[PDB]
Amino acid sequence: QVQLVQSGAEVKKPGASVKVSCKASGYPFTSYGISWVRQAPGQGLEWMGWISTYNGNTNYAQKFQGRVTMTTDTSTTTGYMELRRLRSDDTAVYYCARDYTRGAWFGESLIGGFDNWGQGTLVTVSSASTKGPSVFPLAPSSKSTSGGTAALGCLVKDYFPEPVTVSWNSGALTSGVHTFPAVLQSSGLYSLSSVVTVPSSSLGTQTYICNVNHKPSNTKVDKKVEPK
Amino acid sequence: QVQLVESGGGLVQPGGSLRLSCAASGFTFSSYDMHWVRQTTGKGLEWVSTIGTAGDTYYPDSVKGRFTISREDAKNSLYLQMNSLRAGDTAVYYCARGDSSGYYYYFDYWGQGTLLTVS
Amino acid sequence: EVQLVESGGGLVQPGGSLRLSCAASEFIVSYNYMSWVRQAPGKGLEWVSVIYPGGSTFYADSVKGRFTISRDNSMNTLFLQMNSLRAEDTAVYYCARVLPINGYYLDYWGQGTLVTVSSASTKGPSVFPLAPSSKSTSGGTAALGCLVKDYFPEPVTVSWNSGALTSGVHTFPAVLQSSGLYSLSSVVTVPSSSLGTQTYICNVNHKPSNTKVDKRVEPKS
Amino acid sequence: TNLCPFHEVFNATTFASVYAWNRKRISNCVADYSVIYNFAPFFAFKCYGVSPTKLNDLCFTNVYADSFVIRGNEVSQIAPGQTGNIADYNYKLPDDFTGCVIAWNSNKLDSKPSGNYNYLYRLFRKSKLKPFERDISTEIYQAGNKPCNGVAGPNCYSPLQSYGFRPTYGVGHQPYRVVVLSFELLHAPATVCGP
Amino acid sequence: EIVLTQSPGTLSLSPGERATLSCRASQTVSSTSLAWYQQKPGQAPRLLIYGASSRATGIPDRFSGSGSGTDFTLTISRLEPEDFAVYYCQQHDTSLTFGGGTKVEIKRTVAAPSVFIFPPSDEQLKSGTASVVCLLNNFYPREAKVQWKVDNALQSGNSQESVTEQDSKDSTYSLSSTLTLSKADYEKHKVYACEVTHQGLSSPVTKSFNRG
Amino acid sequence: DIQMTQSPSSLSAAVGDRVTITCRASQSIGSYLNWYQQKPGKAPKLLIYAASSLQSGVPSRFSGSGSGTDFTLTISSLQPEDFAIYYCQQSYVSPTYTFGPGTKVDIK
Amino acid sequence: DIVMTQSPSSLSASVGDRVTITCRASQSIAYYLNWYQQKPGKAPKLLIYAASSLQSGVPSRFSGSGSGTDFTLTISSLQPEDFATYYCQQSSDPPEYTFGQGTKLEIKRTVAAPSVFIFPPSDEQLKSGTASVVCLLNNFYPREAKVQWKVDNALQSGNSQESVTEQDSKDSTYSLSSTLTLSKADYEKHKVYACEVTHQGLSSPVTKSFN
Ligand SMILES: *[C@@H]1O[C@H](CO[C@@H]2O[C@@H](C)[C@@H](O)[C@@H](O)[C@@H]2O)[C@@H](O[C@@H]2O[C@H](CO)[C@@H](O)[C@H](O)[C@H]2NC(C)=O)[C@H](O)[C@H]1NC(C)=O
C-alpha cells in the first residue's frame, strides 16, 4: 500500500526556479531515502540526486552540482526538490522514487533499485504567453472514390500550454480516429492535427464537427467540416 | 491447572509419515513458546523442535528438513509433522512449555508422553 | 641452514611415560607453527599434534588426553610429553615446521627418534646352525646360514669370518614373533667344491646384551 | 519511532575482510526482529545467553553489528571459547558473550570464475588477540634470528593471505557472510527496545 | 563514469516468442549493483530485476535475468500483450547511471500506406500562413520517408513530421507531415507534390495538387 | 555442541541422609544451568533454574550451587519420594539445548 | 574424514622413462595437496605444494597438476636417485591433515629364475624343544611370489613368517626366507616336508624335501 503523490504541472520562464513536492504514505519514512529522476520528452531516464530522510545527507549528480537542492520534512512525510536557473532544455517529467540503493543511516550501497515511483510532474520552460488554438478545417478531395472511403480532419495551430483535447461529434465517431502528438514550432507555440476516415457516401448524409477544448485559456471551439 | 495431553503415536513403517498432536489447557497458549523433546534409552533426553510466538521455527542439525512444527492458536493445539522416518526415531515424545525469568530459559511443564515405534 | 635435532627416544613399559625434545637453529620455535608426526614400522605417516605461534594446541583422537605439546623459549626447544603409553604408540616420531603461506605444508623435518613400548626385557641372541642337505649338488651349495632368535632389542650385526667376506651375505630384516621377541636369519652361497676348506663362521653381536656367540655353523655331515 | 537499520547490515553490497571486520553502532530505535526470522533457512543461527524467541521483549542500551566474510569450514570458530586461526588472529569473542551469530552462503555474490582475491585474512601473529580487538598492520613477520628490515624473503613472510573463491569449490571452501550482534546493557537508560 | 549500452534499440517480435535484451558496461560491474526497469507508454517506470537475478514484488516468472562482469541479459519466456514497452538497465557500482533503453514492438505482416493530400484552408490563407499536410494511413513498418515536391524542385528545412503509436487492433502506424509557408511564396508556385518511399510500396507513390 | 557429564552414575542412600550430585560442562557457561527430576514412567519435573533458584512448589530440601564448569545439587533430607533420575541441562547456547546422562538415586 | 587413495601401490620403471602417480580424494579439496619423497631410514622431503608449486632446490623434472578430486605427479626423466616412496598429503582442513598409503617406485629388470633351497632343523639346539625349518628363495624378480607350506601332504596356516630383503644395487634382485614354527613333539611325528613356491619365472610350482 505504498504510494507517492506529487504536485501538479507547472509552466515557468527562463532564469526562474521551481519547487516540486512528493508526499509518501504507507511505510516508515525515515528508513528509506528519496531519489529524483527526470525524463525529457522522447528521451531516456537521467539521475538527479539522492537524499537521506534520517540525517539530511545528500548526493547530487555532477551535471546538477550547483543548481539543485533537496529537503525533507518528517512531520508531513514530504520531500522537496528545487531547480534554479531554469533553462529551455530543462523541460521534462520529474519523478520521485523510494530508494533502495543507498542506506539512510550509514550511507552505503544496497542490493536493489528504485522500488516505488511517483506519477510524475511536468515542468515547461519557455518564453511565451498563454494563447488559444487557431483551428482550421481540412476538407476531403472532390474525388470521393477508390474504395468509397476518404479522410478528413481539423488542424490546430499556434497554441500554448500543452494539453488540447480533440473530439469528433462529441463521441459519435470514436473508431477510425487518429490524433497526432503535438510538435513544437520555431515560434514557441505548439501544433496538432487529428484525422478520421469516413465512407465517401456518408459525406452527403452525415455532418461532422470538430471539438477543441483548450482548458488553460478556456477557448472551447466547435467547428464543422464540409466538402469543398 | 496447566495440563498438556499428547496423542498420535503408534507403529509406522520406515520411510513413512506420522502426525503428533498436543492440546493445552490452563494457560494463555498464544503467549508462550512450545517445544518437543524426545527420550530414548540410548541417548537420554534430546530436543527436536521449537516454535515461537512470532512464527519462528528452530530445528537441530539432526532432523532438519524432515520434521515440521506448527501452531493453531484458535484450537490450542500443537502439531509435529514427521517425514522420512528412520529407525533411530523410535522414542517417547513430550510437548513442553517454555518460559524465562530474565535471560535464563527453562522448561516448566511437560506432558504425559506418546510413544512412536518405527520398525 | 634450518636444522632440527631430536632426542629422548627409548624403551618404556606399557603404562609408563616419556618426554621427547627437538632443538631448532636458524629459526625460533615460538614464532612458527610446529607439529609432531609418527610413522609406525612398516606403515604410513600419521599426524599427532600441532602448536600455533600464540599457544594453541591440537591433538589427534588416538592420542587425545594422553599427550601434551609445549615449548621453552629460553632453550628454543619443543617438547612432547607422553603419558599412559600403549603398545600401539610405537613408531618413529618427527618434529617438523609448518608453513601456512600457500596451503599447509611441512618444509623442514628432523631426523626422528624411535619409541618402543613393550613388556619384554633385554634378552640375548640364540644361534642355531643351518645345516646343509649334506648331499651332492650339481650347482653351487647355497645352504650355510645362522638363525638368531628371542632377542628384544635389535641393533644386531651378523658377520661372517670377521667381515672378510663381502659377497653372498644376505641378512634378512628381523621379523617380530608372537612371543614378543625379535627373530632374524642369515644365509650365504659357496661353491660346492670348497665346502670343507672355507669353514665359515657366524659373528653375532648384541650390544644391549653384550654377546659375541659363534656357533661355527659346521655342516652336519 | 525511528526503526533500526537492520536491512543495511544484511542487504549491503560489499562486506569487509576478516582482519578489518567493520563494526557498526545502532541506538535509539525500535528493533523488529521479524525480518531476521522470515529470512531463508540460514546455514547457522545461534544465540548465546539470550533465547532467540525472547527477542522483541528485551531492552538494551547499545547494539553492535560486525560483518565480515570467511570460508565455509571456519564458521564454527565464531563462538565463545573457540580456538583457531580466525579466533586467534582475526576475530575473538569473549567467553561471557551475549548475542547472536548469523551466517549464510554467498557463493553467487563473492565468487568469480578466475578467482576473487579481494578478501584477505591474517595467518601470522606473535600473540593472540584480546576480545573485540583489530589489527590492520601489514609489517613483515619475522620467524628467524635475522631481521629483514621490511623486505620479504626466507623466514620473513607477509602476514596476510587471500582466499581466491571460485564457483567450483565445495561447500567448505565457499564464501560465507557473517553478522554478529552484541547486546550491551549498562546503568544508562535503555535505547533499543522491541515492539 | 561507467557507460551502459543497450542493443538493439528496437526489437520487433511476435507475441508468444522469447525476447533477449543486452546491457553491456565499459568497466566491470558487480552483480549486486545491476537492475532492470519497465516503462509502459504514458506511465511511470517499475522495477523488474534487482541483483541481476532476483525478481521484485509481484513480478511473474516470465522475466528472468542472468549475467556477470560486463555482460548482462534479460529474458522474457512468453510475450504477453502487456509486455510490449521500453526496458532500461542501471547500475550503482560507481555513481549511478542509466542505459539508453530498448523498445519491444509487435511484429505483423507488411502493409502499404494510403497517401493523401490536403490543400491549405481558405481561412488560414487570410492570416498569412500556408499549411499542407500529407497523411500516411495505417502501415506496419515505421521506417518511411516523405519528400515535398514544389513545382519541379524539392524543398528542405521547412517541414516537421509526427508519428503515432501502434494501434491496439491492427498494430499499424500513422504519419503526418506539415509544410509551412507564407502567402508571399504560396502564389509564386503552382504545383505541389508529396513523395512517399516505403518498403511495402512497389514504386514511389506521389499524389499532387495544384492551385485552383 | 556442549557435552555435559554427571557423577556419580548411581548413588545409593538411606532416608534422612544428605546426598550430592555433580554436573560438569565442557565449556564455561556461567549460571545457565537447570535441574530436572524424572520418576520411572512419568514426565520430567523442573527443580532448579539459573543454578541457584528454587522453582515454585519444590520443597526447600533441594539446593543448588556452582558457576563456570562445576555444579552441585544437594538434598538436605531424603524423604521416600525423592528416589528418581536427575538431569542437568545447559541454557547458555540456544536453540540447541543439551541434557546430561542422568544420575539415579536408589535406596539402601 | 577425508580419505586419500593412491594408485598404484607399486610401480616399476627404467632410467630415462616417464612415470605418473595418482592421488584420489573422497571430497573436493581444491588445490591443497602436497607431495613428499621418503628414502629408507630418512625423513620425508617436500617436493610439490599447492599441487603445482615446486619447492626450491627440487629438480625441474618434477611436476604436478590437478584440482578437485584427481591429482597427478609426473617425473619427466627418471634417474637412479628418484627411486623412493611417495606420499600425498591433504590440507583442506587446516588443523588436521592426512596422508595416503604411499607409492613405492622400484627399478625395472628382466625376469630372473628363482633358486629354492631348504635347511633341516639342527640337532645342536633341538634339545631346547623348538624345531624351525627354513625355506630359502634367492635372487628372484619380480617381488610377487606365492609360497605355501606342505607337511605330511597337508597345508598348514598361521605358523609361518616371511622376510624379504631390499632390492640389491648390483643385480636388482630380491631374496625371501620362510620359517615354519613347530614344537619338538610334533617334529618327529612325520618326515614329509614340502616347500611350495608359485612364481612367474616358474612354469609349475617346485618343492624340495628332506627327512
Ligand atoms: C533484504 O531484502 C530482501 C528483499 O527486499 C525486497 O526487495 C527490495 C529491492 C525492496 O523492494 C524491499 O522492500 C523488498 O522487500 C528482504 O526480503 C523480503 O522481506 C520481506 C519482509 O520480511 C518479505 O515480505 C519479502 O517476501 C522478502 N522478499 C524476499 C525476496 O526474500 C529481506 O528481508 C531484507 N533483509 C532484511 C534483514 O530485512
Side-chain angles (χ1 to χ4, degrees):
Chain A
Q1 58 183 14
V2 180
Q3 186 176 358
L4 291 79
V5 178
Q6 306 182 208
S7 60
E10 301 291 339
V11 41
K12 291 293 182 180
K13 316 200 70 176
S17 60
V18 61
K19 196 172 62 180
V20 185
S21 172
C22 178
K23 190 177 186 305
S25 179
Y27 67 95
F29 187 64
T30 53
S31 298
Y32 307 88
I34 293 178
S35 300
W36 292 86
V37 172
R38 82 175 185 182
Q39 184 174 17
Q43 299 297 322
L45 304 174
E46 66 172 355
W47 181 61
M48 296 196 63
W50 170 92
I51 190 179
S52 175
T53 58
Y54 172 75
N55 53 11
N57 286 16
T58 56
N59 184 19
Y60 299 139
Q62 186 180 0
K63 189 180 181 180
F64 311 98
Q65 195 65 33
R67 285 197 298 163
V68 64
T69 173
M70 301 179 179
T71 58
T72 56
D73 182 3
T74 314
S75 180
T76 47
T77 67
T78 302
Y80 297 93
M81 185 209 69
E82 184 188 18
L83 188 66
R84 302 178 298 270
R85 308 175 192 91
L86 283 176
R87 214 183 318 171
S88 60
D89 57 353
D90 288 3
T91 300
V93 172
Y94 291 83
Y95 292 102
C96 173
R98 197 181 80 168
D99 178 74
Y100 210 87
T101 60
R102 217 58 162 272
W105 282 55
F106 306 116
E108 299 179 6
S109 297
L110 304 174
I111 306 179
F114 302 151
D115 48 5
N116 298 85
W117 292 68
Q119 29 96 357
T121 296
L122 178 63
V123 180
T124 305
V125 185
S126 180
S127 178
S129 180
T130 301
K131 204 182 177 300
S134 187
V135 184
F136 301 138
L138 305 178
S141 180
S142 60
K143 44 176 299 300
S144 300
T145 178
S146 70
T149 300
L152 76 166
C154 33
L155 168 63
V156 180
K157 189 179 183 62
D158 295 353
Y159 68 97
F160 202 23
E162 179 70 17
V164 281
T165 302
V166 177
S167 58
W168 278 90
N169 303 337
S170 182
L173 286 187
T174 176
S175 60
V177 183
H178 289 330
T179 303
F180 306 111
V183 284
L184 186 61
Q185 299 178 346
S186 60
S187 60
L189 297 320
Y190 293 94
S191 179
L192 184 143
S193 307
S194 182
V195 288
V196 309
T197 61
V198 297
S200 295
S201 61
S202 63
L203 295 177
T205 60
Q206 274 75 24
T207 301
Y208 310 117
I209 71 179
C210 174
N211 312 126
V212 184
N213 300 328
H214 188 10
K215 181 180 61 180
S217 67
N218 299 121
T219 314
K220 299 181 179 181
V221 178
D222 295 356
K223 197 175 188 304
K224 60 180 180 300
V225 178
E226 298 181 0
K228 181 180 181 300
Chain B
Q1 57 180 359
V2 178
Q3 304 182 25
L4 307 177
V5 183
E6 303 89 336
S7 56
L11 52 95
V12 60
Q13 302 178 0
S17 62
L18 197 56
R19 188 183 188 186
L20 268 53
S21 301
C22 168
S25 61
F27 65 99
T28 311
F29 187 81
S30 59
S31 300
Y32 288 94
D33 312 2
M34 301 296 299
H35 318 257
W36 287 92
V37 177
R38 67 143 74 113
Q39 178 179 11
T40 179
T41 64
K43 299 180 180 180
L45 286 166
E46 181 178 357
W47 165 82
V48 297
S49 185
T50 283
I51 189 173
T53 62
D56 37 329
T57 58
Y58 310 90
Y59 306 95
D61 298 1
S62 300
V63 83
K64 185 180 180 180
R66 297 163 42 187
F67 288 6
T68 300
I69 191 174
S70 59
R71 178 194 288 256
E72 184 178 7
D73 283 317
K75 297 187 178 181
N76 293 17
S77 300
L78 187 77
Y79 307 99
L80 183 69
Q81 186 68 32
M82 299 181 297
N83 298 333
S84 300
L85 294 177
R86 287 85 174 270
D89 305 338
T90 301
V92 185
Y93 290 78
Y94 304 93
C95 46
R97 181 187 117 186
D99 196 5
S100 63
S101 176
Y103 292 167
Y104 296 95
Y105 203 86
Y106 49 85
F107 304 141
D108 49 7
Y109 296 100
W110 302 61
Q112 300 84 13
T114 176
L115 176 59
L116 165 68
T117 312
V118 187
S119 59
Chain C
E1 179 68 23
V2 172
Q3 287 285 326
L4 300 168
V5 179
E6 333 187 12
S7 59
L11 165 69
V12 293
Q13 211 79 7
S17 179
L18 198 57
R19 185 186 186 91
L20 298 183
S21 301
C22 171
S25 60
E26 199 68 21
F27 80 90
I28 305 182
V29 296
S30 61
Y31 297 153
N32 296 266
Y33 294 69
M34 307 296 301
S35 298
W36 285 96
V37 182
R38 73 179 173 186
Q39 180 186 17
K43 303 304 179 300
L45 299 161
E46 184 180 355
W47 162 66
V48 177
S49 182
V50 53
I51 188 172
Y52 283 11
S56 301
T57 55
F58 307 92
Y59 305 97
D61 292 357
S62 60
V63 304
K64 194 171 184 299
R66 303 187 294 114
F67 290 5
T68 304
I69 183 178
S70 63
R71 54 197 169 193
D72 198 329
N73 189 25
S74 60
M75 306 176 181
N76 196 21
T77 318
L78 188 78
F79 306 103
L80 182 60
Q81 182 75 58
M82 298 178 289
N83 297 330
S84 301
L85 284 179
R86 307 171 185 174
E88 312 294 335
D89 302 336
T90 295
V92 183
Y93 285 73
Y94 301 92
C95 52
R97 188 187 75 164
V98 180
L99 268 180
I101 294 301
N102 192 19
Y104 288 78
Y105 56 93
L106 296 75
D107 59 335
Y108 290 105
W109 300 61
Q111 54 180 357
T113 55
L114 178 61
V115 176
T116 305
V117 185
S118 178
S119 301
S121 298
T122 309
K123 259 198 59 179
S126 60
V127 180
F128 303 169
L130 299 183
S133 60
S134 67
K135 299 297 298 180
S136 300
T137 58
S138 301
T141 301
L144 300 180
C146 286
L147 172 62
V148 185
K149 193 180 181 300
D150 293 357
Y151 65 102
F152 179 82
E154 193 248 349
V156 292
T157 56
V158 182
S159 183
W160 290 58
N161 291 19
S162 301
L165 183 62
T166 60
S167 300
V169 181
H170 266 350
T171 58
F172 297 85
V175 282
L176 183 125
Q177 295 178 158
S178 60
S179 59
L181 303 180
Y182 287 66
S183 180
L184 188 143
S185 301
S186 179
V187 78
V188 76
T189 169
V190 289
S192 301
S193 300
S194 60
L195 290 178
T197 61
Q198 291 292 339
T199 318
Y200 278 100
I201 57 179
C202 298
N203 295 264
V204 179
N205 183 23
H206 196 184
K207 302 179 181 181
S209 180
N210 301 120
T211 308
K212 296 181 61 179
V213 59
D214 304 60
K215 289 283 291 185
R216 191 184 173 90
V217 65
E218 183 177 2
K220 195 64 177 181
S221 69
Chain D
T1 176
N2 246 10
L3 274 301
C4 305
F6 280 141
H7 70 277
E8 306 187 30
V9 185
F10 284 85
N11 277 329
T13 289
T14 58
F15 270 58
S17 297
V18 206
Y19 79 102
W21 37 262
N22 189 26
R23 167 162 288 190
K24 287 178 189 175
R25 302 187 64 263
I26 307 180
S27 55
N28 292 324
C29 57
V30 182
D32 48 330
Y33 300 89
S34 300
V35 287
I36 306 178
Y37 300 150
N38 295 330
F39 241 157
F42 278 138
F43 185 81
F45 185 16
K46 304 179 63 61
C47 295
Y48 302 90
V50 171
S51 181
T53 67
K54 283 304 178 300
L55 304 175
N56 282 331
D57 202 5
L58 301 178
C59 283
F60 306 97
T61 64
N62 291 328
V63 173
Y64 294 102
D66 313 332
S67 56
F68 51 87
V69 165
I70 58 184
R71 85 150 74 113
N73 57 30
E74 299 176 353
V75 179
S76 62
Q77 298 188 26
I78 314 298
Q82 210 70 21
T83 291
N85 61 325
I86 298 298
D88 295 333
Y89 308 141
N90 296 271
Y91 191 82
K92 180 67 179 181
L93 286 179
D95 294 355
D96 50 71
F97 179 54
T98 300
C100 302
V101 183
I102 300 99
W104 68 95
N105 200 22
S106 63
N107 191 29
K108 296 89 180 180
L109 289 69
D110 298 324
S111 180
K112 300 175 61 179
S114 58
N116 187 10
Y117 300 102
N118 289 327
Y119 291 103
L120 310 171
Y121 63 97
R122 186 174 299 267
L123 68 161
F124 262 141
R125 203 173 183 269
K126 293 185 180 303
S127 58
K128 297 193 294 186
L129 286 177
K130 302 181 298 180
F132 300 133
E133 181 187 3
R134 58 173 60 261
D135 187 9
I136 64 179
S137 63
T138 174
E139 273 66 22
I140 297 295
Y141 182 80
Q142 168 181 328
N145 290 118
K146 46 179 180 300
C148 278
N149 315 117
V151 182
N155 292 328
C156 294
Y157 310 102
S158 302
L160 301 180
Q161 181 68 17
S162 61
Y163 276 108
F165 294 119
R166 289 181 168 89
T168 59
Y169 288 164
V171 189
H173 298 273
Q174 284 177 11
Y176 276 78
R177 294 195 165 182
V178 179
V179 175
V180 283
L181 302 176
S182 301
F183 303 138
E184 180 182 8
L185 63 160
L186 300 176
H187 57 270
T191 62
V192 177
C193 294
Chain E
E1 56 184 0
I2 307 181
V3 45
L4 299 178
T5 56
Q6 297 190 207
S7 301
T10 59
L11 182 57
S12 57
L13 294 178
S14 301
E17 303 182 6
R18 72 184 298 102
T20 291
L21 293 81
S22 180
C23 184
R24 191 183 185 276
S26 64
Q27 305 178 7
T28 301
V29 178
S30 181
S31 60
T32 53
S33 302
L34 199 98
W36 289 86
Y37 292 85
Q38 179 196 68
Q39 183 182 6
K40 299 171 184 177
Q43 292 187 13
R46 55 196 283 254
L47 182 59
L48 283 178
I49 302 296
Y50 64 95
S53 300
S54 303
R55 293 180 290 106
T57 300
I59 300 300
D61 202 10
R62 312 192 301 272
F63 298 94
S64 180
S66 61
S68 180
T70 175
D71 190 7
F72 304 91
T73 309
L74 184 76
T75 297
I76 315 175
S77 57
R78 294 88 57 88
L79 282 176
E80 268 71 6
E82 74 281 353
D83 298 359
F84 295 90
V86 184
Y87 297 81
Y88 297 89
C89 57
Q90 77 106 14
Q91 57 87 15
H92 49 278
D93 184 69
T94 302
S95 186
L96 198 147
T97 50
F98 278 100
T102 293
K103 185 176 178 180
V104 177
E105 305 181 6
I106 288 182
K107 173 72 68 58
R108 62 152 289 175
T109 60
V110 180
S114 183
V115 184
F116 281 67
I117 190 64
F118 298 91
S121 182
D122 300 0
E123 302 179 3
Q124 176 184 167
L125 183 51
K126 302 300 180 180
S127 300
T129 317
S131 176
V132 185
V133 42
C134 182
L135 171 61
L136 285 71
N137 273 332
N138 300 334
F139 53 75
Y140 163 67
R142 160 69 85 91
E143 299 293 336
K145 192 266 300 180
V146 43
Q147 274 291 342
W148 296 93
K149 299 181 176 298
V150 171
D151 293 331
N152 201 20
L154 307 179
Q155 294 293 338
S156 304
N158 51 17
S159 61
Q160 48 189 170
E161 58 180 359
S162 182
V163 193
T164 78
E165 252 289 340
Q166 273 187 355
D167 190 9
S168 300
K169 179 182 60 180
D170 46 66
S171 300
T172 58
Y173 292 81
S174 302
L175 190 145
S176 176
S177 182
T178 299
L179 182 60
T180 62
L181 277 180
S182 61
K183 64 167 56 181
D185 292 355
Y186 185 25
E187 49 83 22
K188 177 169 56 181
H189 306 326
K190 178 62 179 182
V191 180
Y192 296 141
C194 171
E195 192 275 341
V196 177
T197 297
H198 188 237
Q199 175 183 353
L201 292 174
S202 58
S203 59
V205 181
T206 302
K207 290 188 175 181
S208 180
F209 76 108
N210 60 330
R211 298 181 288 99
Chain F
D1 301 1
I2 300 183
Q3 181 179 0
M4 311 290 294
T5 59
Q6 304 192 225
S7 180
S9 180
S10 60
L11 173 137
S12 184
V15 175
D17 297 2
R18 174 188 183 94
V19 302
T20 286
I21 318 178
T22 57
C23 184
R24 183 179 291 100
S26 62
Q27 170 191 333
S28 178
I29 58 178
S31 297
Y32 296 85
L33 187 99
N34 301 333
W35 284 102
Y36 294 89
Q37 174 187 234
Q38 185 187 32
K39 295 184 179 178
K42 292 184 179 180
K45 183 182 179 180
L46 181 63
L47 295 176
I48 297 290
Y49 64 95
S52 62
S53 298
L54 196 68
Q55 175 73 3
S56 180
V58 179
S60 60
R61 317 186 294 264
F62 298 92
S63 61
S65 62
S67 60
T69 52
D70 294 327
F71 306 94
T72 293
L73 180 71
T74 301
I75 310 177
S76 61
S77 181
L78 195 62
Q79 296 199 2
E81 58 274 4
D82 293 332
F83 301 103
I85 303 180
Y86 295 87
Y87 299 91
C88 55
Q89 182 224 5
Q90 68 92 19
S91 300
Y92 180 66
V93 180
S94 58
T96 51
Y97 295 136
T98 61
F99 292 79
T103 291
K104 184 179 180 180
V105 175
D106 301 358
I107 172 180
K108 82 171 187 301
Chain G
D1 296 359
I2 302 98
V3 178
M4 312 299 301
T5 302
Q6 295 196 26
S7 180
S9 300
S10 299
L11 185 58
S12 301
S14 301
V15 182
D17 295 0
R18 185 186 185 96
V19 303
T20 292
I21 302 177
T22 311
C23 178
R24 213 83 60 179
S26 61
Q27 309 176 7
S28 180
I29 64 177
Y31 57 91
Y32 306 108
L33 190 99
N34 307 322
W35 293 96
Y36 298 92
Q37 178 195 49
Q38 189 185 28
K39 297 191 181 301
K42 295 187 180 303
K45 176 184 180 300
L46 178 67
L47 297 176
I48 290 285
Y49 61 96
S52 60
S53 301
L54 187 70
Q55 178 73 7
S56 301
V58 181
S60 300
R61 57 181 183 266
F62 288 94
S63 178
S65 59
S67 181
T69 60
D70 301 66
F71 298 89
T72 179
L73 173 66
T74 311
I75 305 176
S76 65
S77 179
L78 207 61
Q79 288 185 352
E81 53 182 357
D82 301 333
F83 297 142
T85 305
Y86 292 85
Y87 293 93
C88 56
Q89 179 231 330
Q90 143 265 334
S91 61
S92 58
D93 284 321
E96 172 181 0
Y97 54 89
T98 318
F99 295 83
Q101 74 279 8
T103 295
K104 182 177 178 60
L105 191 53
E106 55 185 2
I107 333 178
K108 170 77 69 177
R109 183 196 162 81
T110 61
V111 183
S115 299
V116 184
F117 300 106
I118 204 169
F119 328 100
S122 59
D123 314 7
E124 279 62 28
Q125 288 288 345
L126 226 168
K127 310 302 179 180
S128 59
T130 58
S132 300
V133 45
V134 181
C135 183
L136 173 73
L137 291 76
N138 193 13
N139 302 329
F140 66 97
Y141 187 87
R143 181 183 182 92
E144 290 77 11
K146 186 263 182 300
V147 44
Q148 179 67 22
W149 271 117
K150 284 188 173 181
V151 179
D152 56 84
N153 303 330
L155 288 76
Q156 288 72 16
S157 179
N159 38 14
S160 59
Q161 296 182 177
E162 306 175 8
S163 181
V164 182
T165 61
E166 296 292 337
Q167 200 173 1
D168 182 69
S169 300
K170 300 180 180 180
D171 50 71
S172 301
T173 59
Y174 291 86
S175 296
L176 195 149
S177 65
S178 181
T179 297
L180 192 274
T181 300
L182 199 62
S183 299
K184 177 180 60 60
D186 213 335
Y187 171 56
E188 288 88 32
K189 289 187 58 182
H190 326 75
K191 276 306 187 70
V192 181
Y193 290 145
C195 177
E196 184 184 13
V197 171
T198 300
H199 190 253
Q200 181 177 355
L202 305 180
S203 60
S204 299
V206 182
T207 66
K208 293 188 173 180
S209 60
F210 67 91
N211 59 330

